[PDB]
Symmetry: C3
Subunit: 209 residues, 3 copies
Amino acid sequence: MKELIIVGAGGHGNEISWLAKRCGRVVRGFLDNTVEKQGTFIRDIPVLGTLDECSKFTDCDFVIAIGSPRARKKIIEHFFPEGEFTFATLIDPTATIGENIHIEEGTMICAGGILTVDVKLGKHCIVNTNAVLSHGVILGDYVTVAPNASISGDVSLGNIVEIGANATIREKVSVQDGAMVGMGSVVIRNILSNQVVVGNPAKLLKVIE
Amino acid sequence: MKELIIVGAGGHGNEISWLAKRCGRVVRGFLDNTVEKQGTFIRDIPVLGTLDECSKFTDCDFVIAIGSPRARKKIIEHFFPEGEFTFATLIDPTATIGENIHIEEGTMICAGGILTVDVKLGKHCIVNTNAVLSHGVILGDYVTVAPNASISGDVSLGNIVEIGANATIREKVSVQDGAMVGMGSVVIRNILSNQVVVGNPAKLLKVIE
Amino acid sequence: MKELIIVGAGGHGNEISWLAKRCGRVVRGFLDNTVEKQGTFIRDIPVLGTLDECSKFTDCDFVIAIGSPRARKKIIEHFFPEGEFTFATLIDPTATIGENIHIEEGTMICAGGILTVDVKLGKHCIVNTNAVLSHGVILGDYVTVAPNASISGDVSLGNIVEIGANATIREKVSVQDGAMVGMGSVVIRNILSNQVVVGNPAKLLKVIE
Ligand code: NA
Ligand code: NA
Ligand code: NA
Ligand code: NA
Ligand code: NA
Ligand code: NA
Ligand code: NA
Ligand code: NA
């Protein structure tokens, strides 16, 4: 397979370099805009330069290993014009991927994640450690599902949605584009665009836009 | 082994047909009373007819793949007189079944479920995806444990109990017959018969009967 | 390897005898101070005597299979003077141990636990069933992490901390020595020494000392 460039050398990039190694991929290096990270390494993998160096690595697959949905969308739209680059899809060997699962490119399915049946993910999604997506779940593009999230049957998550760690979503709930569910939330009602909800049961905290 | 008939062609039946395939079982088909589902399929497995056709398949094992505890009890008592039918016990290959685990027939233990030591389940139980039953847990008949439920040591769940997704039950709690714990609940007190409790900490919402 | 002595023949000792068997270890027996447990067994493994018999088994590895952090510290300081005894480190075969994970002796990592990258544990820790410790997590000595706990990146847990079942800790939170997080808590703020916090979001309940 192509060597991999990981965009983002933070905590998620750290864990995605681990995922890539477990997937048998050779990581060429990271791109990252942080001044303090130039000339640094994670486990023998160098930070190669800033994101505008991506054009020097068109021979590589990319992945955008940054948790923020809006960060991944911003980076793809600025640095990765349609058709110019290829993206990896990384699925941990300990993830369970069942039947009629469709995953678009750039997606990361991490250790212990479970996608059962009839699940559809858009591009550049994250399903983090030990999260569960049950029957009929649909994710748009740039969705982040944090560790231990519990997403019941027939849930729909719009584009640039973030589901926080160990949150629980009732079956048949819809979450509109850009919303965010706080860690630990218990979501029993539909969520509107750009809403942040928190708590048990989840209630509106604020709007992100 | 015998071919399997799955009663219920809904979301749970979808996931239990997946479980059966992962268990190496041949699924003859589903029985389901929904008019709109007659002549339909899930992943090449047909809906054969309504539940009163069960008598045409006594050569098959059955499983009642319906989440509602009371639905499974109703169906067994009406359609499955004692001794006339055999029931499968389906344990996902990725479930962990430890030592001195006793599971009665009709039970479904799904992907990533963990039953550690000295756990006892009655007939027609569900332990859904990634749920954990720790030391000394006892379940009656027709218990449903939803995905990611966290059932601590020495918990007793009566007949026709339902524990919702990603709920947490304190060690040594007893839950009487027919009760239901909402998704995400934090249960730190005993629960009486037919009570619905929700929240953190769990409190009485209403009675189911 | 050396035969193992398990200190504590309660619920945790039950599950740790299971862990030891899954790890290929021969358990010589338990030590336990309970009068009613003298002459008893768990799955063919005898309670050998009280903790003051430890000096008769210096040929064995020990593990202190008691959930209470303060119980493990008390027992080590009274019965196990520095250098006189050796301690096992038990890691379930179904635990995922990633890269740059450092675990000190006496630690138990149970079934389905996940430690991703750059995680450090002190002595006599417990990571119970299906718990997740993400990038950069640090635990002191005698930390207990209960089943299904969700500990996000860069969390620091002091000595003798207990994190209850299915609790969730926000990234970069620090928990000072001796604190306890109730089961199911949603921890979004730093915790001070000896504080007990509960709820969603977690709030101070009381002080343990
Ligand atoms: Na699309
Ligand atoms: Na798991
Ligand atoms: Na779309
Ligand atoms: Na019984
Ligand atoms: Na009974
Ligand atoms: Na959980
Ligand atoms: Na230390
Ligand atoms: Na120290």
